[PDB]
């Protein structure tokens, strides 16, 4: 019994460092979600004002916009946790081969 | 359970909510939503031609 | 020279930070194009040039010039696209920075 | 009519927006009172069972 | 991971001074295109009232 | 401009410095009480066994 | 085994907590992250030019 | 966070503002657009002229 | 024009003369409360220890 | 001169060998720690069967 409860409290602490890692990831990913949102508003406005805005400023928007999607890059890379890039979109990928994940 | 506990969210909030409400001033003040800083440098360059 | 901003925690997890603008670049074709495309900015061809030949020229006729004027606007106008491209860069940065940080 | 167009670029709702510098003035203090709290809470922690 | 931090806190520090930075050369951006407005109107005054 | 860069190096966060004002000050008290404790247990070791 | 202990890293904590809290007070008095202390003084170098 | 906020872009408005209501009020007390200042000294030039 | 120029030899810009005579009460009342603090620390220190 | 693409000037070797520096005395730590546990038991044993 006391081996489970030893084991136990090891696997508690390996609950919480679940907890810490899954809140990690979670947070990067409503930052993520954050620039989606302003995504959005720059399809909108990719929109082109409909066809009003010209291709400079169009060119001005891709400019916020790839910007922003080397902040989402950057959010899928920074975030390693004990440096593991948890929201490595390829890490965890279950492919045709389950091993890959 | 007592010595990391800052409410460090709350942390991040503050210069955030602070953030914002200069910005909601910076835009008050000029009375225009058009700011010196280039987010939306598209509408800024539209109207600035 | 390239700007960079030192970002990750890892090393050379960089922004790259361009800026190109001066009182000398105004139209810039791929530089001055002699008086026009730059100058016309610096030098100001108003003195007779303008009264000599106002519209037939386009190289004292104020067609360029006013197009000097124009593109340096939509230089200054894009570089504050990059500029406010990269602000918001920041924003997020920090956003990421305090979230996966805390 | 060029004018009110660039005014459109560069309109403020000085209603909305003063609402939200009022709102955001109120989340700062409120989320302030939380961090003063969330030193309150630890002290209480230690002091209670020291 | 404490180093993680470390070196995130200190490029936070550079992120912030980005800000102060582009925000600098921004500001004075828009200074120099309320001259080239002005400019505009100089060369519409440089129209040489036509002739 | 200048003035808000130079602020950022000269910043303080003062939620968050006040913060750790009190929480080093928790842990100077704590850590105190251990240097207390820590006084009170070898006694016990005498004279429990002189 | 009673004539050593005195929780000499406590000891050894404790001005350090000391001192923690002395540059704590330290900025929050200037409200200034910048010391006289020339910790950082590449940041404080940089903000005096 | 805060002891150097003081809305400083607003603080530049502030004699921007005034001055553009001197520059009002001076046109307005003249009834006539034409200053003493060189501003558009040209114009100023022909109607001396 | 004299007057004018003199007027900017002593000029105030009250906004921020005002908003600075309030900062640097708030930074004297600001390091007032680190005085306060100051004393109360090695209150703490002996009284917990002595 | 080169802040990245060296990466033996480039910023990248050199947070390796503080990043690695710190793995190695956390491994050299991980085995100090491994003895002080051997010395645990140890005692613990000789303090038992001794008796």
Request: hydrophobic share 30%; charged share 45%; proline share 0%.
């Given at each position: 019994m006391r081996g489970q409860i030893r084991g136990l409290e090891m696997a508690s602490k390996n609950s919480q460092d679940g907890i810490s890692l899954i809140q990690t990831a979670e947070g990067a990913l409503t930052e993520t979600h954050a620039i989606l949102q302003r995504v959005r508003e720059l399809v909108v406005q990719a929109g082109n004002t409909g066809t009003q805005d010209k291709a400079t400023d169009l060119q001005s928007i891709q400019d916020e916009i790839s910007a922003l999607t080397d902040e989402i890059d950057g959010i899928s890379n920074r975030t390693e946790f004990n440096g593991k890039k948890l929201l490595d979109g390829t890490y965890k990928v279950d492919t045709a081969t389950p091993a890959n994940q | 359970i007592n010595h990391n506990i800052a409410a460090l969210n709350t942390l991040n909030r503050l210069p955030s909510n602070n953030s914002a409400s200069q910005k909601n001033m910076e835009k008050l003040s000029s009375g225009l939503?058009?700011?010196?800083?280039?987010?939306d440098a598209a509408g800024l360059a539209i109207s600035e031609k | 020279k390239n700007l960079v901003f030192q970002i990750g925690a890892n090393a050379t997890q960089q922004i790259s930070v361009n800026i190109e603008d001066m009182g000398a670049d105004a139209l810039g074709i791929k530089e001055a194009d002699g008086s026009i495309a730059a100058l016309h900015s610096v030098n100001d061809l108003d003195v007779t040039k303008f009264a000599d030949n106002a519209a037939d020229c386009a190289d004292i006729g104020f067609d360029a010039q006013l197009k000097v004027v124009d593109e340096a606007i939509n230089q200054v106008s894009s570089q504050r696209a990059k500029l406010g491209a990269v602000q918001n860069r920041l924003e997020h940065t920090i956003n990421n920075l305090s979230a996966s940080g805390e | 009519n060029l004018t009110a167009a660039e005014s459109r670029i560069r309109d403020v709702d000085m209603a909305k927006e003063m609402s939200e510098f009022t709102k955001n003035n109120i989340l700062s203090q409120a989320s302030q009172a939380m961090l003063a709290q969330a030193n309150q809470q630890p002290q209480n922690v230690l002091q209670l069972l020291r």
């Open positions: - | 939503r058009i700011n010196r800083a280039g987010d | - | -």
